Coordinates of C-alpha atoms and ligand atoms in Angstrom, one line a residue:
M1185 CA 5.3 -30.1 -10.8
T1186 CA 9.1 -29.2 -9.4
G1187 CA 9.9 -25.6 -8.6
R1188 CA 11.9 -25.6 -11.9
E1189 CA 8.7 -26.3 -13.9
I1190 CA 7.0 -23.6 -12.2
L1191 CA 9.7 -20.9 -12.5
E1192 CA 9.5 -21.7 -16.4
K1193 CA 6.0 -21.6 -16.7
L1194 CA 5.9 -18.6 -15.1
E1195 CA 8.8 -17.1 -17.3
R1196 CA 6.7 -18.3 -19.9
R1197 CA 3.5 -16.4 -18.1
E1198 CA 1.3 -19.2 -18.0
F1199 CA -0.3 -17.9 -15.1
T1200 CA -2.8 -20.7 -14.3
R1201 CA -4.3 -21.0 -10.9
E1202 CA -2.4 -24.3 -10.8
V1203 CA 0.7 -22.7 -11.5
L1204 CA 0.2 -19.9 -8.9
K1205 CA -1.0 -22.0 -6.2
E1206 CA 2.1 -24.4 -6.7
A1207 CA 4.4 -20.9 -6.2
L1208 CA 2.9 -20.3 -3.4
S1209 CA 2.8 -23.6 -1.8
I1210 CA 6.3 -24.7 -2.4
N1211 CA 8.3 -23.6 0.5
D1212 CA 11.6 -24.9 -1.2
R1213 CA 14.5 -22.1 -0.4
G1214 CA 16.2 -22.5 -3.9
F1215 CA 12.8 -22.1 -5.5
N1216 CA 11.9 -19.0 -3.4
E1217 CA 15.0 -17.3 -4.3
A1218 CA 14.7 -17.8 -7.8
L1219 CA 11.1 -16.6 -7.5
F1220 CA 12.6 -13.6 -6.1
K1221 CA 15.4 -13.3 -8.7
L1222 CA 12.7 -13.5 -11.4
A1223 CA 10.4 -10.3 -10.2
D1224 CA 13.5 -8.6 -9.1
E1225 CA 14.7 -8.9 -12.9
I1226 CA 11.1 -8.1 -14.3
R1227 CA 10.9 -5.2 -12.0
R1228 CA 14.3 -3.9 -13.4
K1229 CA 13.2 -4.5 -17.0
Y1230 CA 10.0 -2.8 -16.7
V1231 CA 10.4 -0.1 -14.2
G1232 CA 13.6 0.4 -13.8
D1233 CA 15.4 1.5 -10.9
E1234 CA 13.9 4.4 -9.7
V1235 CA 12.1 4.0 -6.6
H1236 CA 9.3 6.4 -6.2
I1237 CA 8.5 8.4 -3.0
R1238 CA 5.2 8.8 -2.1
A1239 CA 5.1 10.9 1.3
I1240 CA 1.9 9.9 3.3
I1241 CA 0.3 12.1 5.8
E1242 CA -1.9 10.4 8.0
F1243 CA -4.3 13.3 9.1
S1244 CA -7.1 11.9 11.1
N1245 CA -7.5 8.6 12.6
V1246 CA -11.5 8.8 13.1
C1247 CA -13.2 6.0 11.5
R1248 CA -16.9 5.1 11.6
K1249 CA -15.9 1.7 10.2
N1250 CA -15.4 -1.5 12.7
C1251 CA -12.9 -3.6 10.5
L1252 CA -11.7 -6.2 12.9
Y1253 CA -8.3 -6.2 12.1
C1254 CA -7.6 -2.4 12.4
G1255 CA -6.7 -0.6 15.5
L1256 CA -8.7 2.5 14.1
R1257 CA -12.2 0.3 14.4
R1258 CA -14.9 2.7 16.0
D1259 CA -15.2 0.4 18.8
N1260 CA -11.4 0.9 19.9
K1261 CA -12.3 3.2 23.0
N1262 CA -8.4 2.7 24.3
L1263 CA -7.1 5.1 21.6
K1264 CA -6.8 8.8 21.7
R1265 CA -8.4 10.6 18.4
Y1266 CA -7.3 13.1 16.2
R1267 CA -7.8 15.2 13.0
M1268 CA -5.2 17.8 11.6
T1269 CA -6.7 21.0 10.6
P1270 CA -6.9 21.6 6.6
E1271 CA -4.6 24.5 7.3
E1272 CA -1.8 21.9 8.9
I1273 CA -2.5 19.4 6.3
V1274 CA -1.4 21.7 3.9
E1275 CA 1.8 23.4 5.2
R1276 CA 2.8 19.8 6.3
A1277 CA 2.1 18.5 2.6
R1278 CA 4.2 21.8 1.4
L1279 CA 7.3 21.0 3.6
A1280 CA 7.0 17.6 2.3
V1281 CA 7.3 19.1 -1.4
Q1282 CA 10.2 21.3 -0.2
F1283 CA 12.0 18.0 1.0
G1284 CA 11.5 16.7 -2.6
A1285 CA 8.4 14.5 -2.3
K1286 CA 6.8 14.2 -5.9
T1287 CA 3.4 12.3 -4.6
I1288 CA 1.5 13.7 -1.4
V1289 CA -0.9 10.7 -0.2
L1290 CA -3.6 11.5 2.2
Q1291 CA -4.8 9.0 4.2
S1292 CA -7.1 8.7 7.0
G1293 CA -9.9 6.5 8.7
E1294 CA -13.4 7.1 7.2
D1295 CA -14.0 10.5 9.1
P1296 CA -16.8 12.0 7.7
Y1297 CA -15.8 15.7 9.1
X1298 CA -13.9 16.5 6.1
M1299 CA -16.2 14.7 3.2
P1300 CA -16.2 15.7 0.5
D1301 CA -15.6 19.4 1.0
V1302 CA -12.5 19.8 2.9
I1303 CA -10.6 17.3 1.4
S1304 CA -11.5 18.8 -2.2
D1305 CA -10.3 22.2 -0.7
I1306 CA -6.7 20.4 0.8
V1307 CA -6.5 18.7 -2.7
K1308 CA -6.7 22.1 -4.6
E1309 CA -4.3 23.8 -2.5
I1310 CA -1.9 20.7 -2.7
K1311 CA -1.9 21.0 -6.4
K1312 CA -0.8 24.4 -6.8
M1313 CA 2.7 22.9 -5.9
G1314 CA 3.1 20.9 -8.9
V1315 CA 3.1 17.3 -7.5
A1316 CA 0.9 14.2 -7.7
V1317 CA -1.9 13.6 -4.9
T1318 CA -2.9 10.3 -4.2
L1319 CA -5.8 9.9 -1.5
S1320 CA -6.7 6.7 0.3
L1321 CA -9.9 7.9 2.3
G1322 CA -12.0 4.7 2.1
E1323 CA -15.4 4.0 0.8
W1324 CA -17.4 6.9 -0.2
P1325 CA -20.2 7.8 -2.7
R1326 CA -19.1 8.1 -6.3
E1327 CA -20.0 11.9 -6.0
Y1328 CA -17.2 12.6 -3.4
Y1329 CA -14.9 10.5 -5.7
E1330 CA -16.0 12.4 -8.5
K1331 CA -15.8 15.8 -6.5
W1332 CA -11.9 14.7 -5.6
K1333 CA -10.9 14.5 -9.0
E1334 CA -12.6 17.5 -10.4
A1335 CA -10.3 18.9 -7.6
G1336 CA -7.0 17.7 -8.8
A1337 CA -6.6 14.3 -7.3
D1338 CA -4.3 11.8 -9.3
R1339 CA -4.6 8.9 -7.6
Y1340 CA -6.5 6.3 -5.0
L1341 CA -5.8 3.4 -2.9
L1342 CA -8.2 1.6 -1.9
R1343 CA -7.5 -1.8 -1.1
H1344 CA -9.6 -4.9 -1.7
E1345 CA -8.2 -6.4 1.6
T1346 CA -9.4 -10.0 0.9
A1347 CA -11.2 -11.4 -2.6
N1348 CA -13.1 -13.9 -0.7
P1349 CA -16.7 -12.3 -0.3
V1350 CA -17.3 -14.4 2.8
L1351 CA -14.0 -13.6 4.7
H1352 CA -14.4 -10.2 3.7
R1353 CA -18.0 -9.5 4.8
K1354 CA -17.1 -11.0 8.1
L1355 CA -13.6 -8.7 8.6
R1356 CA -15.3 -6.1 7.5
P1357 CA -19.0 -5.8 8.9
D1358 CA -20.4 -2.4 8.1
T1359 CA -19.4 -3.3 4.2
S1360 CA -18.7 -6.0 1.4
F1361 CA -16.4 -7.3 -1.1
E1362 CA -19.2 -6.1 -3.7
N1363 CA -19.2 -2.4 -2.5
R1364 CA -15.3 -2.7 -2.3
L1365 CA -14.8 -3.7 -5.8
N1366 CA -17.7 -1.2 -7.0
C1367 CA -15.6 1.6 -5.5
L1368 CA -12.5 0.4 -7.0
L1369 CA -14.1 0.4 -10.5
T1370 CA -15.9 3.5 -10.2
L1371 CA -12.4 4.8 -9.4
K1372 CA -11.3 3.4 -12.7
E1373 CA -14.2 4.9 -14.5
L1374 CA -13.3 8.7 -13.1
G1375 CA -9.9 8.5 -14.5
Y1376 CA -7.9 7.8 -11.2
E1377 CA -4.8 5.6 -10.9
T1378 CA -6.3 3.0 -9.0
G1379 CA -4.5 1.1 -6.2
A1380 CA -5.8 -2.2 -4.8
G1381 CA -4.1 -5.0 -2.7
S1382 CA -4.5 -7.0 0.2
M1383 CA -3.4 -8.3 3.5
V1384 CA -1.7 -12.1 4.1
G1385 CA -2.2 -14.2 6.8
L1386 CA -5.6 -12.9 7.9
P1387 CA -7.8 -15.2 10.1
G1388 CA -9.3 -17.5 7.7
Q1389 CA -7.7 -16.7 5.0
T1390 CA -6.2 -20.1 2.9
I1391 CA -3.5 -20.4 0.3
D1392 CA -6.4 -20.6 -2.3
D1393 CA -7.5 -16.9 -1.1
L1394 CA -4.1 -15.7 -1.9
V1395 CA -4.2 -16.8 -5.6
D1396 CA -7.4 -15.5 -6.0
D1397 CA -6.1 -12.1 -4.8
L1398 CA -3.7 -12.6 -7.4
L1399 CA -5.8 -13.6 -9.9
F1400 CA -8.2 -10.6 -8.9
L1401 CA -5.6 -8.0 -9.5
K1402 CA -4.7 -9.7 -13.0
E1403 CA -8.4 -9.4 -14.0
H1404 CA -8.5 -5.9 -13.3
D1405 CA -4.9 -4.8 -14.0
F1406 CA -4.4 -2.2 -11.0
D1407 CA -2.2 0.8 -11.2
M1408 CA -0.9 0.1 -7.9
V1409 CA -1.0 -3.1 -5.7
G1410 CA -0.3 -2.5 -1.9
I1411 CA 0.5 -5.9 0.0
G1412 CA 1.1 -6.3 3.5
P1413 CA 0.9 -8.9 6.2
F1414 CA -1.8 -9.0 8.7
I1415 CA -0.4 -7.7 12.1
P1416 CA -2.8 -8.3 15.0
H1417 CA -3.7 -5.4 17.3
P1418 CA -4.1 -5.5 21.0
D1419 CA -7.6 -3.3 21.1
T1420 CA -9.1 -5.6 18.4
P1421 CA -11.0 -8.7 18.2
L1422 CA -8.1 -10.3 16.4
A1423 CA -5.5 -9.3 19.2
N1424 CA -4.6 -13.1 19.6
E1425 CA -4.5 -14.4 16.0
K1426 CA -1.6 -15.2 14.4
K1427 CA 0.7 -12.5 12.1
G1428 CA 1.2 -12.9 8.4
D1429 CA 4.0 -14.6 7.4
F1430 CA 7.1 -12.5 6.0
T1431 CA 8.1 -14.8 3.5
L1432 CA 4.6 -15.8 2.1
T1433 CA 3.8 -12.0 1.9
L1434 CA 7.0 -11.2 0.2
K1435 CA 5.9 -13.9 -2.5
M1436 CA 2.8 -12.4 -3.0
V1437 CA 4.5 -9.3 -4.3
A1438 CA 7.1 -11.0 -6.2
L1439 CA 4.3 -12.8 -7.8
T1440 CA 2.3 -9.5 -8.4
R1441 CA 4.9 -8.0 -10.2
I1442 CA 5.5 -10.9 -12.4
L1443 CA 1.8 -10.7 -13.1
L1444 CA 1.7 -7.1 -13.5
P1445 CA 5.2 -6.0 -14.5
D1446 CA 4.3 -2.5 -15.1
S1447 CA 2.7 -1.6 -12.2
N1448 CA 3.7 0.2 -8.9
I1449 CA 3.6 -2.0 -6.2
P1450 CA 5.0 -0.3 -2.7
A1451 CA 7.2 -1.6 -0.3
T1452 CA 4.8 -1.5 2.6
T1453 CA 5.8 -0.1 6.2
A1454 CA 3.8 -3.4 7.6
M1455 CA 6.5 -5.4 5.8
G1456 CA 9.3 -3.4 7.9
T1457 CA 7.6 -3.6 11.0
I1458 CA 7.2 -7.5 10.6
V1459 CA 10.7 -7.9 9.8
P1460 CA 13.8 -5.6 10.7
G1461 CA 14.6 -4.3 6.9
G1462 CA 11.5 -5.9 5.7
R1463 CA 11.4 -3.1 2.9
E1464 CA 14.5 -3.1 1.8
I1465 CA 13.8 -6.8 1.2
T1466 CA 10.9 -6.3 -0.4
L1467 CA 12.3 -3.5 -2.9
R1468 CA 14.9 -6.5 -4.0
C1469 CA 11.6 -8.9 -4.9
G1470 CA 9.8 -6.6 -7.3
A1471 CA 8.4 -3.4 -5.2
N1472 CA 9.7 0.2 -6.8
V1473 CA 7.6 2.5 -4.6
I1474 CA 8.5 3.7 -0.6
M1475 CA 6.1 5.7 1.3
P1476 CA 7.9 7.6 3.9
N1477 CA 5.8 8.5 6.8
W1478 CA 5.3 12.7 6.8
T1479 CA 2.4 12.2 9.5
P1480 CA 3.8 15.2 12.2
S1481 CA 4.0 14.6 16.0
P1482 CA 2.1 14.3 18.1
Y1483 CA -0.3 12.4 15.9
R1484 CA 2.3 10.1 14.3
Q1485 CA 2.0 7.7 17.1
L1486 CA -1.7 7.7 17.4
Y1487 CA -2.3 6.2 14.1
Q1488 CA -1.9 2.8 14.7
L1489 CA -3.4 0.7 12.3
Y1490 CA -1.3 -2.5 13.6
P1491 CA 1.2 -1.9 16.7
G1492 CA 4.8 -1.5 16.5
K1493 CA 4.8 1.1 13.7
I1494 CA 8.6 1.6 13.0
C1495 CA 8.1 5.1 11.6
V1496 CA 6.6 6.3 14.9
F1497 CA 9.5 7.6 17.8
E1498 CA 11.6 9.2 14.8
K1499 CA 11.6 13.4 14.4
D1500 CA 8.9 14.7 11.9
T1501 CA 10.9 15.1 8.9
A1502 CA 13.3 12.0 9.1
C1503 CA 11.4 9.3 7.1
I1504 CA 12.2 11.3 3.8
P1505 CA 15.9 11.7 4.1
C1506 CA 15.7 8.0 5.5
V1507 CA 14.3 6.5 2.7
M1508 CA 16.6 8.8 0.5
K1509 CA 19.6 7.1 2.2
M1510 CA 17.8 3.5 1.6
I1511 CA 17.4 4.1 -1.7
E1512 CA 21.2 5.1 -2.5
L1513 CA 22.2 2.1 -0.6
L1514 CA 20.3 -0.3 -2.4
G1515 CA 21.8 0.8 -5.5
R1516 CA 18.5 2.4 -7.0
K1517 CA 17.6 5.9 -7.8
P1518 CA 15.1 8.3 -6.7
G1519 CA 11.8 9.1 -8.9
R1520 CA 12.5 11.9 -11.3
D1521 CA 8.9 12.6 -12.1
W1522 CA 5.7 12.0 -10.4
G1523 CA 5.8 8.3 -10.7
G1524 CA 2.9 7.7 -12.6
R1525 CA 2.2 4.4 -14.3
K1526 CA 4.2 3.9 -17.8
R1527 CA 2.1 1.0 -19.3
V1528 CA 4.3 -1.2 -21.5
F1529 CA 1.4 -2.4 -24.0
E1530 CA 2.2 -6.3 -24.8
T1531 CA 0.5 -9.6 -26.0
Ligands
LIG1709 C1 27.6 -16.4 4.2 C2 27.7 -15.8 5.5 C3 28.8 -16.8 6.2 C4 26.3 -16.3 6.2 C5 26.3 -15.5 7.6 C6 24.9 -15.2 8.0 C7 24.1 -15.5 6.7 C8 22.8 -15.2 6.3 C9 21.6 -15.6 7.9 O1 21.9 -16.8 8.3 C10 20.5 -14.9 7.6 C11 19.7 -15.4 6.1 C12 19.5 -16.6 6.4 C13 18.8 -17.8 5.4 O2 18.1 -18.9 5.5 C14 19.6 -17.6 4.0 C15 20.1 -15.9 4.0 C16 20.4 -15.3 4.9 C17 21.0 -13.7 4.6 C18 22.2 -15.7 5.4 C19 22.8 -15.8 4.0 C20 24.2 -16.2 4.3 O3 24.4 -17.9 4.5 C21 25.1 -15.6 5.6 C22 25.2 -14.1 5.0
LIG1710 C1 23.6 -11.1 0.7 C2 23.1 -12.7 1.1 C3 24.9 -13.2 1.2 C4 25.6 -13.3 0.3 C5 26.4 -14.5 0.7 O1 27.4 -13.7 1.2 N1 26.9 -15.5 -0.3 C6 22.3 -13.0 -0.5 C7 22.2 -14.1 -0.2 C8 20.6 -14.6 -1.0 C9 20.4 -13.5 -1.2 C10 18.8 -13.2 -1.6 C11 18.4 -13.9 -2.9 O2 19.1 -14.4 -3.8 C12 16.7 -13.7 -3.1 C13 16.6 -12.5 -3.3 C14 17.1 -12.3 -5.1 C15 16.5 -10.7 -5.4 O3 17.6 -10.6 -6.7 C16 17.6 -9.8 -4.5 C17 17.1 -9.9 -3.4 C18 17.4 -11.3 -2.6 C19 16.6 -11.4 -1.4 C20 18.5 -11.5 -2.3 C21 19.7 -10.3 -1.3 C22 21.0 -11.0 -1.1 O4 21.9 -10.8 -2.5 C23 21.0 -12.3 -0.4 C24 20.3 -12.4 0.9
LIG1711 C1 13.6 22.7 2.7 C2 15.0 23.2 3.2 C3 14.7 24.9 2.9 C4 15.0 25.1 1.5 C5 13.8 25.0 1.0 O1 12.4 25.1 0.8 N1 13.9 24.0 -0.6 C6 13.0 23.9 -1.4 C7 13.7 22.6 -2.1 C8 12.4 22.7 -3.2 N2 12.8 21.0 -4.2 C9 13.1 19.8 -3.3 C10 12.3 20.9 -4.9 C11 14.3 21.3 -4.7 C12 14.6 20.2 -5.8 C13 16.3 20.5 -6.3 S1 16.9 19.4 -7.2 O2 18.2 20.5 -7.7 O3 17.2 18.6 -6.0 O4 16.3 19.1 -8.2 C14 16.1 22.5 2.6 C15 17.3 23.0 2.9 C16 18.4 21.5 2.3 C17 17.4 20.8 1.7 C18 17.9 19.3 2.3 C19 19.7 18.9 1.5 O5 19.3 19.7 0.3 C20 19.7 17.4 1.7 C21 18.6 16.5 1.0 C22 18.7 16.7 -0.4 C23 17.8 15.6 -1.2 O6 17.9 16.0 -2.4 C24 16.2 15.9 -0.5 C25 16.3 15.4 0.8 C26 17.1 17.0 1.6 C27 17.4 16.3 3.0 C28 16.8 18.2 1.8 C29 15.7 18.6 2.0 C30 15.0 20.0 1.8 O7 15.2 20.4 0.7 C31 15.9 21.0 2.6 C32 16.2 20.8 4.0
LIG1712 C1 16.9 -12.9 10.2 C2 15.2 -13.1 9.6 C3 14.4 -13.2 11.0 C4 15.1 -12.4 12.2 C5 14.6 -12.6 13.6 O1 13.2 -12.1 13.8 N1 14.9 -13.4 14.5 C6 14.3 -13.7 8.5 C7 13.3 -13.4 8.1 C8 12.6 -13.6 6.5 C9 14.0 -13.8 6.3 C10 14.0 -13.6 4.5 C11 12.9 -14.3 3.7 O2 12.6 -15.5 4.1 C12 13.0 -13.9 2.7 C13 14.5 -14.3 1.8 C14 14.7 -15.7 1.7 C15 15.8 -16.4 1.3 O3 15.8 -17.6 1.0 C16 17.1 -15.6 2.2 C17 17.3 -14.1 2.3 C18 15.6 -13.6 2.7 C19 15.7 -12.2 2.5 C20 15.4 -14.1 4.1 C21 16.8 -13.7 5.2 C22 16.4 -13.9 6.9 O4 16.3 -15.2 6.7 C23 14.9 -13.1 6.8 C24 15.0 -11.8 7.0
LIG1713 C1 21.1 14.5 4.0 C2 21.2 12.9 4.2 C3 22.3 12.9 5.5 C4 21.7 11.8 2.9 C5 21.6 10.9 2.8 C6 21.5 10.2 1.7 C7 21.6 11.0 0.7 C8 21.1 11.1 -0.8 C9 21.8 9.7 -1.4 O1 23.1 9.8 -1.3 C10 21.4 9.5 -2.7 C11 21.4 10.9 -3.8 C12 23.0 11.4 -4.2 C13 20.6 13.2 -3.9 C14 20.8 12.2 -2.8 C15 19.0 11.6 -3.0 C16 21.4 12.0 -1.6 C17 20.7 13.5 -0.7 C18 21.2 13.3 0.7 O2 22.7 13.8 0.6 C19 21.1 12.5 1.4 C20 19.4 11.9 1.6
LIG1714 N1 -3.7 -5.0 11.5 C1 -3.2 -4.8 10.1 N2 -2.1 -5.3 9.8 C2 -2.0 -5.1 8.6 N3 -2.2 -4.1 7.5 C3 -3.2 -3.4 8.1 C4 -4.0 -4.0 9.5 N4 -5.3 -2.8 9.7 C5 -5.3 -2.0 8.3 N5 -4.3 -2.2 7.6 C6 -4.2 -2.0 6.4 O1 -4.0 -0.6 6.3 C7 -4.7 -0.3 4.9 C8 -5.3 1.4 4.8 S1 -6.9 1.6 6.4 C9 -6.6 3.6 6.1 C10 -7.3 3.7 4.7 C11 -8.7 3.8 4.9 N6 -9.7 3.7 6.1 C12 -9.0 2.1 4.0 O2 -9.7 1.3 4.9 O3 -9.0 1.8 2.9 C13 -6.1 -1.0 5.0 O4 -6.3 -1.3 3.4 C14 -5.5 -2.2 5.4 O5 -4.8 -3.2 4.5
LIG1715 S1 -9.2 -0.5 7.7 FE1 -9.8 2.2 7.3 S2 -12.2 1.7 7.1 FE2 -11.5 -0.2 8.1 S3 -11.2 0.4 10.7 FE3 -9.3 0.7 9.4 S4 -9.4 2.8 9.3 FE4 -11.7 2.0 9.4
LIG1716 CL1 0.7 7.2 -5.0
LIG1717 CL1 0.3 0.5 -0.1
LIG1718 CL1 1.0 -1.1 5.4

């Protein structure tokens, strides 16, 4: 079909595999710009002009897993490992709340040391501050997720990475797509607001794989969807592979908004790493969330999932003010509340 025809089907919500494949395969500038406009408009209509700020503290770069794409993979000996103390994490969260953060995201490698009880203790202390707590700690037993929910955690981010089970197992040799999905289903069952999402441009990933990622997200109706380009890391087996394409990744974000109009969708730091101003573009093509880095020195520079991260040389407290300026210059507003999902039930 022509681009005009694909757009019309998207506007009528005929979200067929064929329509999604064609949307991702067409490279016409006019088509792409119309797609981005559509996603921007849907975002405005369903989630408004508030951009929700989630302050992220990357509190440990220790990891037991060996994901082929990730700089924190256990086989990477060329990385100084660190662990923030629970007191450091709590006080760093407190500083973020003092700076106006209404959600605190705790992210780490899969570091056994903290699991589950130290995390629970930290979550309890941060919840006293009257903010939302989101965890992004990887794959753990149901019992750990249960304990963290009881401790007061609100949300959990666990990107599905790739919905192709063969590619998933190759890239993540400690685990499987089946495991990843089971974690996500468990998190939802436990009452977390649950985030999934994927990387774009992984080695061996196809356009049909991207369509499958979109259909998977639509199937499970996730509260949050985190999408970024694959960025090769020099100290990993994928060092010499091609980076994901910014425009294709942007189309995935746009299509995600169109498919899941009331979801929360970040403009990820990976988008701003591969293209200067990439986050700002992404906030205008369907995204409505930003995650300023709140990891303190000297640890921020050591949390290297991928290289070149833009947040690294800035002062400890720079990123919250930075994103507030960003939000204003985009003609948007900061979030007024915790920015939980506001479901619009439809047909
Ligand atoms: C209208 C004025 C003159 C020219 C000068 C530089 C041009 C931009 C840049 O070329 C970068 C980019 C290339 C894409 O292709 C299309 C979009 C974009 C943003 C261009 C838009 C427009 O064309 C600009 C602002
Ligand atoms: C500012 C420049 C140059 C305008 C000019 O100088 N001529 C114009 C030219 C094409 C415009 C983009 C496209 O529309 C696609 C997309 C639609 C969303 O809705 C808002 C985001 C985005 C990326 C737009 C932003 C901006 O508006 C652009 C870059
Ligand atoms: C942390 C310190 C010391 C005082 C303190 O510990 N303050 C706790 C405030 C707690 N809250 C954020 C919940 C207040 C919300 C009030 S509000 O009226 O916005 O609803 C205070 C003193 C001045 C404050 C900055 C300025 O103001 C400018 C700017 C306003 C934005 O907006 C948020 C960002 C920013 C950079 C502010 C951050 C922070 O806050 C500062 C550094
Ligand atoms: C100027 C840089 C390249 C910088 C560099 O690295 N040199 C390139 C890389 C990705 C490009 C954007 C995307 O294509 C999406 C979108 C398509 C619209 O059509 C026009 C607007 C927009 C925002 C594009 C503008 C511009 O063209 C970008 C920022
Ligand atoms: C303190 C730094 C410099 C400046 C740069 C942009 C400013 C914000 C924006 O103006 C939007 C809004 C008004 C209020 C809020 C969030 C402002 C707070 C503060 O004034 C900021 C963060
Ligand atoms: N090289 C790379 N390029 C782009 N994104 C990457 C990347 N390496 C890792 N990521 C992304 O960073 C996200 C957080 S990894 C940290 C949280 C947890 N260990 C977990 O695995 O879920 C991953 O879900 C992945 O999508
Ligand atoms: S993606 Fe998460 S689990 Fe995999 S190596 Fe990186 S930090 Fe560890
Ligand atoms: Cl969140
Ligand atoms: Cl994310
Ligand atoms: Cl990212």
